[PDB]
């Protein structure tokens, strides 16, 4: 939440935000806030097998909730209707590309240099949006 | 359970006995001693989850029967049996019939009623029972 790219720090302002390293076991847990246990209350000697059942249900939704449905977007979804996105302000994707980054290495000729090798990568790409239709003024930011 | 016909009341004598009102949700709630809650014991730290499991069950078969197996005929037909009419003394239902009462109005014409209206319910209406066999000596009763 900066306000202005003034309160940005050095590297965040000419490199950009940092993002997610790509999903693995532990780069993609569950969130840190997961419950482990779900506590219920019983009177001294004796327990209500229908709350139980409603504390059941009741966890399902805090689950759901917490394991996929964070944004609001998504738990409209989860009923089977939908949101625009000036519902909650969600820039629109309009397109997404990813490719991988491949090269050659090139061969160290002289004396001390020979049999070495230094990788150039260079790989080419397009990016092609179909044509889109502008609802409203903005803009159309494309980034890596 | 009136032992005679003297035994009823000036109104009940007269113009028979009150029904329900048309179902509604006011008029048709859960019988007044629906269970809300179901109590199940425990040691003093430790609670059997098989006995749980049981106490489910059994639980399940209260409900079944407060909410719609009250009669001895219903819970027999629960287990996909049968029970004669002779079974428990009900009377054979031998035609049910139902219709809407419709009219017209009367339109008022002299100097103070010009405007006015009266509304004159009067509707047709036929009311067959197919032929049926009577096994035993009895009635044949038809109410409106």
Redesign the interface.
Request: net charge negative; proline share 5%.
């Given at each position: 939440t900066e306000a202005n790219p003034s309160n940005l720090n050095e590297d965040d302002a000419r490199y950009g935000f940092r993002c997610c390293h790509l999903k693995n076991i532990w780069s993609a847990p569950l969130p840190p806030e997961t419950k482990l246990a779900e506590e219920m209350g019983?009177?001294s000697?004796?327990?209500?097998?229908?709350?139980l059942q409603a504390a059941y249900a009741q966890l399902h939704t805090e689950q759901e909730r917490t394991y996929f449905m964070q944004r609001y977007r998504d738990v409209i979804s989860s009923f089977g209707g939908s949101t625009s996105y000036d519902a909650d302000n969600r820039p629109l994707l309009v397109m997404h590309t990813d490719f991988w980054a491949s090269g050659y290495d090139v061969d160290g000729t002289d004396q001390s240099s020979l049999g070495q090798f230094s990788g150039r990568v260079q790989q080419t790409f397009k990016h092609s949006v179909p044509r889109f239709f502008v609802p409203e003024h903005g803009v159309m930011m494309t980034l890596a």
């Amino acid at each position: 939440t900066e306000a202005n790219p003034s309160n940005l720090n050095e590297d965040d302002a000419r490199y950009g935000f940092r993002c997610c390293h790509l999903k693995n076991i532990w780069s993609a847990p569950l969130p840190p806030e997961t419950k482990l246990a779900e506590e219920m209350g019983i009177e001294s000697n004796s327990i209500d097998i229908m709350g139980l059942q409603a504390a059941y249900a009741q966890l399902h939704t805090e689950q759901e909730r917490t394991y996929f449905m964070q944004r609001y977007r998504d738990v409209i979804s989860s009923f089977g209707g939908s949101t625009s996105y000036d519902a909650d302000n969600r820039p629109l994707l309009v397109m997404h590309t990813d490719f991988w980054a491949s090269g050659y290495d090139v061969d160290g000729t002289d004396q001390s240099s020979l049999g070495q090798f230094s990788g150039r990568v260079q790989q080419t790409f397009k990016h092609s949006v179909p044509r889109f239709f502008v609802p409203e003024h903005g803009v159309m930011m494309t980034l890596a």
